Subunit: 344 residues, 4 copies
Amino acid sequence: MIDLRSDTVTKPTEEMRKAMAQAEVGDDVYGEDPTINELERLAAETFGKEAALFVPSGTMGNQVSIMAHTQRGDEVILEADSHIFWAEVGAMAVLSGVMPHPVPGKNGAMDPDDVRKAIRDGNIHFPRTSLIAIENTHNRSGGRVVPLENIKEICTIAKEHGINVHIDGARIFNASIASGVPVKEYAGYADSVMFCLSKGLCAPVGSVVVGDRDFIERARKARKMLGGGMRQAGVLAAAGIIALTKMVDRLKEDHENARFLALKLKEIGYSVNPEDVKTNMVILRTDNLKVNAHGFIEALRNSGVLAEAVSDTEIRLVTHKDVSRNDIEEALNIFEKLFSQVQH
Amino acid sequence: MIDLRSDTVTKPTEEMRKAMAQAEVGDDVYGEDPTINELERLAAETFGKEAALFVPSGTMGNQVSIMAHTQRGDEVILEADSHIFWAEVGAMAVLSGVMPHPVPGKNGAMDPDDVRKAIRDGNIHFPRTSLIAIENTHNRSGGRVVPLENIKEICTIAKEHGINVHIDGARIFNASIASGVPVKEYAGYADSVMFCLSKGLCAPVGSVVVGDRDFIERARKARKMLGGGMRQAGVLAAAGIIALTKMVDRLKEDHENARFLALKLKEIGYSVNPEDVKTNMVILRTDNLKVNAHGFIEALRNSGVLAEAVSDTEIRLVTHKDVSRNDIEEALNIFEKLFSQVQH
Amino acid sequence: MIDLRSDTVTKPTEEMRKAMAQAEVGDDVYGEDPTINELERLAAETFGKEAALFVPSGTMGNQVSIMAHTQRGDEVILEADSHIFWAEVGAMAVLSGVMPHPVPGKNGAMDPDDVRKAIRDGNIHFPRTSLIAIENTHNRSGGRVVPLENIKEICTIAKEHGINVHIDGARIFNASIASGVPVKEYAGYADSVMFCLSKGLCAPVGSVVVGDRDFIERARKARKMLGGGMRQAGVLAAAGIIALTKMVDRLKEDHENARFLALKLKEIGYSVNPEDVKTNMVILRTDNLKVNAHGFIEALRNSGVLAEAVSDTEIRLVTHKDVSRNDIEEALNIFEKLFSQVQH
Amino acid sequence: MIDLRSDTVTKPTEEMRKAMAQAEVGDDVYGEDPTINELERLAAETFGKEAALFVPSGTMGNQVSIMAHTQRGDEVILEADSHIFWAEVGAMAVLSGVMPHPVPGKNGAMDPDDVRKAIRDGNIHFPRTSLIAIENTHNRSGGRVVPLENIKEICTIAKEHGINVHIDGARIFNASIASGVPVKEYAGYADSVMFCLSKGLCAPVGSVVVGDRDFIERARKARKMLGGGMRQAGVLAAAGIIALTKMVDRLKEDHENARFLALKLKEIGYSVNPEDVKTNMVILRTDNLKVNAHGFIEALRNSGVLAEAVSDTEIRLVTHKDVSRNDIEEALNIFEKLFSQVQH
Ligand SMILES: Cc1ncc(COP(=O)(O)O)c(/C=N/Cc2ccccn2)c1O
Ligand SMILES: Cc1ncc(COP(=O)(O)O)c(/C=N/Cc2ccccn2)c1O
Ligand SMILES: Cc1ncc(COP(=O)(O)O)c(/C=N/Cc2ccccn2)c1O
Ligand SMILES: Cc1ncc(COP(=O)(O)O)c(/C=N/Cc2ccccn2)c1O
Ligand SMILES: [Ca+2]
Ligand SMILES: [Ca+2]
Ligand SMILES: [Ca+2]
Ligand SMILES: [Ca+2]
Ligand SMILES: [Ca+2]
Ligand SMILES: [Ca+2]
Ligand SMILES: [Ca+2]
Ligand SMILES: [Ca+2]
């Protein structure tokens, strides 16, 4: 099977497996795991922030950030197709008692004027707007890179109102590799950033939240409440340090493989826009096929290629360390064989 | 002052004042207030439902309905400009732990195909869609009437998936008067309807939720939790019986006054669409004026007319029993004088 | 029927009925109801506070106070048998996301040393203690009066830790009449007090929260969220002004009737402690009877007397304006006849 | 340092470190991690249950169980000193919207008659009792073993009412070793059991929830919402399998070391009851010392022994794999040297 479903399926490198076996550990509830502590120090340093917090998932990273930024009855502005709204189980309503205010963007970029219009006036009928969340890269639109200028303008709006800014940077190193913007420059326009270790950077488990000391203290207590306060989690942090410090540069290979995949899919005749492919994701539309996305996914699966439908007419293909150029070429031979069987 | 801010400002009639003074009362927590019990009986009968529940506000009516229809973490589909999302203080997230799924409609009518697309499939990442809310009339769009066929098709969609349907019928009698659809007919396509007594029907306080016996018992316990469990509330229900049984027919006068207001505002030169005015509300746009909506609201207030801005470029004018045709004519004179000094 | 179930069953006086009929009203959402505004002014003045808030029930009064005093995850210290824990539908957990810390008291008075021990230290495992609630009079223990020195010492403890203090003063005027302590004096040791109009003071609907300006504005927004934001509620406030200004002194009659009831029940042979009866409630124990409290309640109801069991072995009898000494004498005759057939 | 603070401080065995490095992993969000899957199969088999769910902490295990057993506004009966109430950050109120009903027990055993009395009647004022939680062993009382007969009688009560039963079995294998009761026999009297891998069984991270298939499916979705849905968590489950299958028998050594510690502390002159010591915990009281528990903890820390104060007059000592008999003897020499310096 060639697995193009997600970059979460990456398996740990040999260096990571060794580091996990040899990890120096302690009880993180007492702040005594030295490898967790070093991962958090490195993460804060990398992002230009005072403090950092390891969490067992990107979902938890986002939700403790929302909890630490908000009070009950607040409203959170976020992009209408972003992960926090789409695919985090409604946690923001249950855990934090906040409402989402979905703003449809273009490729993850909310028009700053629409962000302005979404902020609630001080009026007894309205929730209090206390948080704006930005996702970079933006998953649903195809791993698109949100321009730094968009983040800067939204930060400017937030400072005018006293509103917190959170970046869902699950794939912020993919954004950085594609744009040349260092992650600490994105992070300078936010109060908090969540970034994942367990996607393209190939750690088996985890993400990190970075921000100011007082915010991270609140987020750490939120983590305890949600159940993310682990014991000898240095076993995980050992792999996370390798992910953060050694696995960023090679994300360029995933980007090259996704672009090559898209170029050749277009040549075959599929509805793909290679010009849209800036990081490790390709959106393929079924408009010129007689099957819908779900039927094409099943046909691919039966032919040895795993992918996911993100709508009835769109499939998402995701590259990562565990699909090589050889694997991409094999997948393309499978896509080529299938095209005459599914074309309209 | 000529008050076009809202139809909530209606004061009780002399008949209502007499009825409140001599209301037969009892302790509603024990179900022993005879006037509450008769109002609920009349309301259930009027709407063709098994049971009904008096509440002190339309907000509480919507929120106990949401609580009784949902579990924590569920999603509620509703129109993106509907009152439950716009102007109920984020209560659905705080009180029920549910997420709104805002669907932008056309004049309050969500496209049924967009409703279909908004229902979550059963994946672990997604909330469970358990409720669809429809607002009729639709406030923000200008008191617009949602077509019965829209409500009917959404009811069919909901039945398929085992999803509940709630009508926010704050102004459902205005809708009925304008469409000719009996309120019982609207209500047959919903599990619950909230309708207000304290707006155009001129009661001083309250709304009523109608629905099935088991739903209403759940909503009654939700009412107790939220603090709507009153004692000798028959004082209020006495005016409510008069509102429900005697004040519906004259809503036609409010509609005629709103249509007259809109026609004459257009003749003066203001940006109004009299063809959009089907019940008791008029939207005026400030696009051809030197001031925005907030500037115009202040100019109007200084000149003796009260209205509200619903955006930076739109004001909402609402007619009701306590603005006569005389008052509308006087307001139009004020609008005419103001036009030369606000015109662009 | 002779109704000893509760003092909530009080019906409005003729003076109240006239006042409701001619109440001067306005839209309370705009702060424009003159009778609500005067009731809140009188209430704040009576209790020595900056501001006040009318609410439709004592439950809502307590719950908006909790919301305005707390953040999600906080803990609220309160007496283990107090109404907020016992009989407010778990609202503090649902609406505010706070945990109760029940402290068993003696006659409603929590030992201040137990309050000290219940305050959480700052550890990551513990909620933040942000509120202490005191109930005076204390309902479940038999309408008992919490000593002023208890309230004073708990106030000192709370001030030390920056913890808010709420008095559930549903029956604070009963406490004041029995103790000689002015309600303003009780209230000076609390941040907020909720007191009821709809119990012994005989208004048909409502309670009032008093406190600081900023707290009351937070509580007013909480009221909007919960659905207590009414329109022309001056109809209710007119009766409330009469309740607050004219119905306090005669609570002495309720106390005398309760004490007479208890003395005569003991003379008959029932298990009652007349020395415990300081306001308008009597606890009767069924330990020397063939029936339990529920069996005795049914026997009483069949004989024309309404009361409530508060446990399997205890019934609560409550006096109020609508049970005269004549009615108490008639109830005692019924109790005497029943004794020979229920006695053990 | 001799660390008697907790059994959470256990470090992974050499066999665990090897197994983590060699773990066969996959993406647990897709159910594709074979080592997680095998751990869950083994756990369900061991406890006689249909299904099992790995979680990153015991706190998360308890809280997803509460979420899966309850609806908003429910009440949970639990022992007044149990971990869910004492030390889980008020999560049950925030995450599930439920109230605790603390019942003071004797050594973790709630009197079944008190459990009966705590169940709420069906009444509009009351939350719905839907869950009873039992903790075995009971931490705060000194690692005490709850008798099987207590669990059986509480199960009997729950079946009469349709109430769910959850065992907080963080240390259920310690209970089993001490009592001879197999864990699947305890579990047969519960709907769910949470047990920890990361305490005495020496895994670095994690716990497991066991129960019926439908309950575990709900708990798995709760885990996704809280942020416990990890990716290649087979690295952790590899150690967890060794913990579950190889580390249970040697808990007897921890019990022998705790009993030896207690016997010799009593001989030295400290206020310890060796007869109370049935598993791996010892409570030492400071009643006969001139210092309180906090001062004694600091004196111990400065002398090379780590422990924790659980009140102002009580310290808890906890044995585990990483304190040997040699370490216990060294700690006792330190306790002996200190006694003349702190005795009253
Ligand atoms: C932008 C963003 N933010 C947060 C998370 C939550 O991170 P998690 O809780 O899964 O560790 C994710 C997870 N995406 C998983 C996925 C699956 C298939 C294809 C692509 N992506 C995310 O894309
Ligand atoms: C559709 C709808 N649903 C619920 C409510 C809540 O009802 P309340 O809690 O206020 O009783 C309202 C209230 N509209 C008040 C208003 C003010 C100004 C202009 C127009 N309308 C509503 O329009
Ligand atoms: C101390 C206290 N606080 C708040 C409330 C809530 O107030 P409500 O939401 O009902 O307006 C009550 C209500 N007691 C009603 C009752 C019934 C039978 C016998 C005695 N009392 C209360 O005693
Ligand atoms: C009975 C019980 N249940 C759940 C948990 C939560 O498990 P956690 O979320 O920490 O993995 C714990 C944790 N006790 C940690 C501790 C520290 C010091 C001394 C003794 N114990 C527990 O004792
Ligand atoms: Ca900032
Ligand atoms: Ca991975
Ligand atoms: Ca239906
Ligand atoms: Ca009105
Ligand atoms: Ca104060
Ligand atoms: Ca009354
Ligand atoms: Ca069962
Ligand atoms: Ca451990």
